[PDB]
Design a protein around this nucleic acid. Sequence first.
RNA 1: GCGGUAGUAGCAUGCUAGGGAGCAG
RNA 2: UGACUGCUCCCUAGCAUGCUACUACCG
Lengths: 586, 201, 620, 187
Amino acid sequence: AVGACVLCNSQTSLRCGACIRRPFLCCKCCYDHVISTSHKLVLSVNPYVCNAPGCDVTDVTQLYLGGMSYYCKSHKPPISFPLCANGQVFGLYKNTCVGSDNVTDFNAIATCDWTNAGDYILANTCTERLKLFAAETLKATEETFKLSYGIATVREVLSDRELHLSWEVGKPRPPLNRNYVFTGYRVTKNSKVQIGEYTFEKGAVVYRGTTTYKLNVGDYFVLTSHTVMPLSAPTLVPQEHYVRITGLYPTLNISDEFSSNVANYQKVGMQKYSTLQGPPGTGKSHFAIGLALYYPSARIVYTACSHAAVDALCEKALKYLPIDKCSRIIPAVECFDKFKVNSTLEQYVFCTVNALPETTADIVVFDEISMATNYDLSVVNARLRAKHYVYIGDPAQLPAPRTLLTKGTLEPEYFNSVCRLMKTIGPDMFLGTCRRCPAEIVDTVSALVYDNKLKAHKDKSAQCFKMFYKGVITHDVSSAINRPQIGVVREFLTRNPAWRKAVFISPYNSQNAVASKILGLPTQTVDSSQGSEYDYVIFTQTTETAHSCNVNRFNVAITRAKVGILCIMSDRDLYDKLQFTSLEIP
Amino acid sequence: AVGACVLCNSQTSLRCGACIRRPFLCCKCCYDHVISTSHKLVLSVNPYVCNAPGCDVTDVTQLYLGGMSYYCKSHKPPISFPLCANGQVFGLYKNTCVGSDNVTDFNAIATCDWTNAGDYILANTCTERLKLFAAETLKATEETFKLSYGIATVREVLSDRELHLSWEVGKPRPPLNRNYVFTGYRVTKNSKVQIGEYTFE
Amino acid sequence: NFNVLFSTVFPPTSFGPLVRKIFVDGVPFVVSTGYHFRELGVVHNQDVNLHSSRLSFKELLVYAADPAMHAASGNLLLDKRTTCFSVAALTNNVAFQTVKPGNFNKDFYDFAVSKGFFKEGSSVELKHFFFAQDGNAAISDYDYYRYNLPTMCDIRQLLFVVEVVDKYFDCYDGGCINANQVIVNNLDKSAGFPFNKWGKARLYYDSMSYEDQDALFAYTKRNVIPTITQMNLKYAISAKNRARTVAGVSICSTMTNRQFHQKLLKSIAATRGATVVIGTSKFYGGWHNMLKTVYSDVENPHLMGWDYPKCDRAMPNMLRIMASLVLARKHTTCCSLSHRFYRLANECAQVLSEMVMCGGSLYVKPGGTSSGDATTAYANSVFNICQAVTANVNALLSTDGNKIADKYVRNLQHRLYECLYRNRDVDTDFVNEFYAYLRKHFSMMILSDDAVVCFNSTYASQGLVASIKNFKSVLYYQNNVFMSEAKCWTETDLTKGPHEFCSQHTMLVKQGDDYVYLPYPDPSRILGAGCFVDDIVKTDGTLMIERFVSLAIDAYPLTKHPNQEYADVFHLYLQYIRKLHDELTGHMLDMYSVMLTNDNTSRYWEPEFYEAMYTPHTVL
Amino acid sequence: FSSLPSYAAFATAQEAYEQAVANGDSEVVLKKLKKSLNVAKSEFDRDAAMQRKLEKMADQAMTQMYKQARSEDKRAKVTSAMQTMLFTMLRKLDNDALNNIINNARDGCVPLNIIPLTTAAKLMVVIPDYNTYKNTCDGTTFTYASALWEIQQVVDADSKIVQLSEISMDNSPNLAWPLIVTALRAN
RNA sequence: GCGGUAGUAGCAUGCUAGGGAGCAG
RNA sequence: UGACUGCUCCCUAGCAUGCUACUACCG
Ligand SMILES: [Zn+2]
Ligand SMILES: [Zn+2]
Ligand SMILES: [Zn+2]
Ligand SMILES: [Zn+2]
Ligand SMILES: [Zn+2]
Ligand SMILES: [Zn+2]
Ligand SMILES: [Zn+2]
């Protein structure tokens, strides 16, 4: 009930009641926020509401203080005193305030119902605590929106890859894939019982989860909305290039995992943070593995953003680094348990930001910056307080599932504070070495966003195919379908024998489900499917609208396949920019 | 509690709140200590501060002596007389006090950072007890400016007489020879443990 | 009554709390969910939940007061110093606690000696000191519970004595009160174990809001909460060299016992002219009024007083149950029948037979009273009245009825036998008749196991009214103690009051125009309080002059005593007060320059300020 | 107390009236002066009293709310302390013997007095004198409560180590006798 | 000419709250 | 390490009531 206000940092006892997160407001700030905005409720050690029996007023500018309680105009005693006066609300530490002038932007942040692009513009354009508050309230409103959904009434199950499941009345079908996790809890007689961490395929219900339970009666599948804890640390800590390498020990020999990893260490050893600006399959994986043994006496942390993207997080660590030096952190969902759980002392911890064993370090690595918000940066900076760290990830990737915005797409400058921090002043690191890839992605993404700092390592045989087909779009439900995909898969496998074992990018997951039901291709997620790409992939049409195709969803999709990248021109794409081979359908 | 201010030859219970050794100054002597410089806080048998819960007043020039207690300016029950008034500060020995002719002894040498030659100059231009105050304040400033540097520690050990050494957070390092003996302590989990006497050059 | 007899066969390790395992967020606990009493049988809790989420504040308070976890997370203990049952040791060391001597006020002693005091052959000498004790004193004093034995009662006679006692307790009102009507004084006292590791009673009375207290109080009408009692040693002046120990009850028991009993306790301590004299003062003519009330209109008056050897270590359990039931009879509208039984069970489990923490170990209390609960003195008064009533009944029923000259008393004895052994239900008319007979021929004044009785003498000689021998026999066969008649007195002259009541003697002096009764203490007690103190409290009189003012107030009536040193005590105190004041003024004017005034201060060394405290006019 | 809303009017009227008086005008101006100044002071009176009442009311309200906040902070810290104590004492329950004797019960309830008697790992014995000692814990291993215990340490009333070789009949009067014996459950 | 009302000062009376001390069971 | 009640004395702060006094308004 006592703390610092979000603007003056002065001691206060007043909580605003019309903001969903109940921030701590300074008395002058409280007056400014209650006058210039329809936020007319204030909370103190006791609520600032009329206590007259039978009365109901919840204003602040309307109440009068009398005796010991608070009263209104209709019940003010002869000894009365208005709470809202002198442009300053009545509360503790009223004489030790300083006020602030950043009230209009704070009002806009509080009043912004998160509708248009300017919402995120001003979310990313403010001072530190306002960034934290905006991120917190954005996650709060999105989790409230997703919890405003029904309960999956289930009473029986057909079999594996089949399910009958019913939502509530007046509630629509929730979003489809693992980006919106389905984790429910049924009841037997008195309490809740375990169901399983799952996700649904289509509407036939195949299971893309990782378990199988005796599912039937009284089952409650829900997208579990979690209470959000308040933030402590800022989104980033301002760096300063050291002169002493404190704690860091370049070994006598050279652990030559990679050649340029020496330079890696050379400039990541002095600044309080860094970032691994990695194009797909371009050293985005094991530079930290080399750092593991070149700096073996340094406490090194590894993390990502989702439990799905732990492939390179967990493989080479056990593959080449010593067995004992690794450590595992997994809540107990289904993920790689290759290292040791329940071990506090170790130098190489591998996990996600979901849950860690609270400790501090001096070296951290952090993956998947593209779908990372300032909330995740703040929580990783709070849980881990290190000396240097790297944010693995590239702006030429996908945004976080910000379904909140509908009008304007969220561009690289609006991913998070760090993702534009390396955009304005330049990246901490810039690689130009593709591990295993022909120069198609080189040409494409170097003309688009890579600025041609990486060039042809593998030859361009021009086996990849792009055609003149356009496609037709039709909406049914929150997922759509494509007749010039139900026919187009067959029309494109007519005689070409090379893309029969390709992977299916899924702008619409229901369309991929229908393709699997009819012809059959593996389902490939869009956002959380980096590093899971095979050697051979089809980029399908699947859409023409502003769902996916402005710039930054295909920058990694062009790199899914290595030699045979069938990226047909679907819609208002970057058609007249390069050279691509084509075959005309009969 | 009851010490001695001797330049004014005055037993006292008062002392300056923000100063070197919590020095003892009589009523008029504390007064010209708090008007010739800025020392607006004093300590008596009990410290002078408003006694209502939640109130905060560091200053003494506006406190009042209320109902067997002290109250203040911003939060003012003023049924009292002011604490600081009539060339004096309220306390015992308010009548048997003399004062000081040389007003700026403390105001000169207790107000600088105890490192200029003027400190020792005036210390030699003192009396026996005044120069005793001087010498004790020199020892106090020696220790209080020695306790502003780092603590060396050996975290991984090497062969004796050739080790590795990391130090502290941001602080500077003092001179280098064996003048400063590095005799610290070891911590197992919460306690202090036998270490010995060391020296880093 | 039958359970008391039958419980002596079964093993002693099958009595007490019954525990089981519950789960809170997947972790296992061990909590108490019932009790097995020697008297009340098996009792099970009504609201117990095995699986639960994170617990609240009152659940934490309840689980932190249960001895189950403390006993289950401790070491086994076999103690051969005592013969009482032992449970567990909470630490790896045994704590030995000593008692320190007193502090000597040399200035007062020299002043008294310089005025002709403490000479050889004098009638006033010091016999009150601070005695010191060695390490193994607390356990040696706790080992006195071996005098508590299981006692079966004559049920057909107890069921009539309880009716007569309830008739005695009839002019009051009581019931339950809300948490906002509870009055607590001195909230800066201990809260018991283990609550004394974090604060006093103020912390727990502030941290708990009103509906939390109400919910906690309503929780104990369907469940049983066993607690832990801590034993402490006293540091006070006395005349004998044995250690004294009091019991510190837990806060969770006192907090609810107050809400249960405070209305009746306050109603008892506000009535004047009743049998129980708790609340009446002795100043402003109170002593004379009490003495005149107790004399009533008895026909051949004598006075008598008795004594209880080992009163609290030897009181049987059945009488404590009876006292609790008598006190709890005012709840006929605010409480149901199950609520009253559960309140009785909670009281029995907390202050009659529970784990005590002596030294650093847990023991089992066999029985008796734990002096220090919320209802000590009133229960003692009920017990005293019960014993007096059964002594009168035994005196009347054991007399040859063929030699009783009066026929009314013969019919009364016949009806008494019929109502005791030939009637199954209550007969209110005879209860009223016996109560009137007792109040006419046997008058009492009771203050928590201290009593003065004015009785008809010829009736007692003929055997129609209880005597000292009847009290001796009743105590022998119902209390398991022997009452020597060397600690009892008898006074056949009413112009001199009781020989001793509440450690005060009585004298009949002439003040104004009439004659009144005044109490005076033992001079040795006053002088010992003057000369032996705890440090800082004295040995410097100027720092506390208000001690001697109170001590001289207590010692005023000694000036009317025919003996001469007794008045000299009061005069010496007055002269010492004047000397202390003069010392303060001069001793402060000398080194400092503050000048003192003697306005309305001389009243403290003149007798008129003290004479007004014993004259009936009621000031402040 | 000097810039009240009515202060300006009162002071201006007083100044004008006294200037008129100093002008030496007729008695009518003096009567008007007296009436105007009387009513001006009368109206200033309540404006000077009500404000002083209100300030003290506000100060009392502030003090009460501050003490309420302090009480809440103390409650939070005592709750944390109690939770810590409970969860710390939980970690010594020996959850295999306790589970073994709980499952044997017919409904899950067992007396509390037999839990340390059958599941404790350590035993402490306090011995008054040597005659009692030689009948209870003579030797190095003894039997009590249908179990076998072996001695681990012996201290005295002063908490100093005592070796079993000097606990004899001849050397008995040279020890602080309230001896404490510590043993462990065998096998 | 008498009374009413509004502040201000001194004095007395009983409660509530806080602190220090004494006795009794 | 300091239990539950009862009574009494001293000091300060607030509230209510009453007595007197000094100005002012009104009739
Ligand atoms: Zn708001
Ligand atoms: Zn503010
Ligand atoms: Zn109202
Ligand atoms: Zn100073
Ligand atoms: Zn001086
Ligand atoms: Zn103040
Ligand atoms: Zn009741």
